[PDB]
């Protein structure tokens, strides 16, 4: 299969952005999705355990919609790459990348 993302996206300072990825061309069960901002963990959506949000993003992330993540109160420090890491049963990994530019405002 393959992972499709919005690619390069823009958002206004103080606004919100929905980070989303779509896994296509595989019927394998998605067991977990991790979200990273650059090399830092934002959140984990595990099919059984739900949503883990890292303490530094607790007040700024709204889990979902679905396997996506809503990042709120954007600042210029949120500009950069984000990754969605899909885990598929039994042992697969698919990684998508999004580049966000936060504009002043």
């Amino acid at each position: 299969g393959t992972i499709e993302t919005t690619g390069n996206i823009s958002a206004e300072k103080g606004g919100s952005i929905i980070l989303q990825c779509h896994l296509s061309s595989t019927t394998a069960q998605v067991t977990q999705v991790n979200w990273e901002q650059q090399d830092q963990l934002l959140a984990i959506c595990n099919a059984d355990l739900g949503w883990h949000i890292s303490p530094s993003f607790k007040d700024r992330v709204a889990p979902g919609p679905g396997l996506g993540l809503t990042l709120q109160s954007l600042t210029v420090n949120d500009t950069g790459e984000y990754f969605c890491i899909y885990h598929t049963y039994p042992d697969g990994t698919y990684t998508g990348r999004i580049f966000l530019e936060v504009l002043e405002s």
Epitope: L41, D48, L49, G50, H52, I53, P55, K58, D91
Partner: antibody
């Protein structure tokens, strides 16, 4: 330093319920979930569930779903574990353990609460 | 449910020995495995999370390795304070489950 201080030992009759508390200090209570894990005498560790104080969302192991309730009070930074319909096999040390920043592992543990279930 | 099989169940070692404990998961759990130390009559303590990341304050003689289904906890040079039971735990589904533990004692 982070500390989790649990309530004292409990002695309960079969069929009753027990409610244990876990008071957190030294960190922002709502930024981390609180898990519960128990250990029967001479046995291994068994996870019960967690409460997320940020949104009052609880997750339970299927083995305890419907018999345990996990709650939290942000005003006092306290988590609670209420286990009902107690049986002698529920005799164990019950720990609260903070969920770590990067996933579902247990990074800080309370001192434990002994619960004896007996007639 | 994901089952965790730890081996050996018990190990006798001398101070200064290299100790290896293994943990096998019944499903591929990527690097979502943590290790705990429990001294007798004491509370469990996190040693390693995410298969290889040392927890704060844990000495360098402890290291974790592996991924997928097979994981190892190594103590490079055993110290007397390392006498404990060690547990692995996956964190890739519900219920979160632990291995049955490895009891470490000093050989004499």
């Amino acid at each position: 330093e982070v500390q989790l201080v649990q309530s004292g030992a409990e002695v309960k009759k079969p069929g009753s319920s027990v409610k244990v508390s876990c008071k957190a200090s030294g960190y922002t209570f709502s930024s981390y979930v609180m898990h519960w894990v128990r250990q029967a005498p001479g046995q291994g560790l068994e996870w019960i569930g967690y409460i997320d104080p940020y949104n009052d969302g609880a997750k339970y192991a299927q083995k305890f779903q419907g018999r345990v309730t996990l709650t939290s009070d942000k005003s006092t930074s306290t988590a609670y574990m209420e286990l009902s319909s107690l049986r002698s096999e529920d005799t164990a040390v019950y720990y609260c353990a903070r969920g770590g920043p990067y996933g579902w592992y247990f990074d800080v543990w309370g001192q434990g609460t002994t619960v004896t279930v007996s007639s | 449910d994901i089952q965790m099989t730890q081996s050996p169940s018990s190990l006798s070692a001398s101070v200064g020995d290299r100790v290896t404990i293994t943990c096998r998961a019944s499903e591929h759990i990527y690097s979502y495995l943590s290790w705990y130390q429990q001294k007798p009559g004491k509370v469990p303590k996190l040693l390693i999370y995410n298969a290889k990341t040392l927890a704060e304050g844990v000495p360098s003689r402890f290291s974790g390795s592996g991924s997928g289904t097979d994981f190892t906890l190594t103590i490079s040079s055993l110290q007397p304070e390392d006498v404990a039971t060690y547990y692995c735990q996956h964190h890739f589904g519900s219920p979160l489950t632990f291995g049955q533990g490895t009891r470490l004692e000093i050989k004499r």
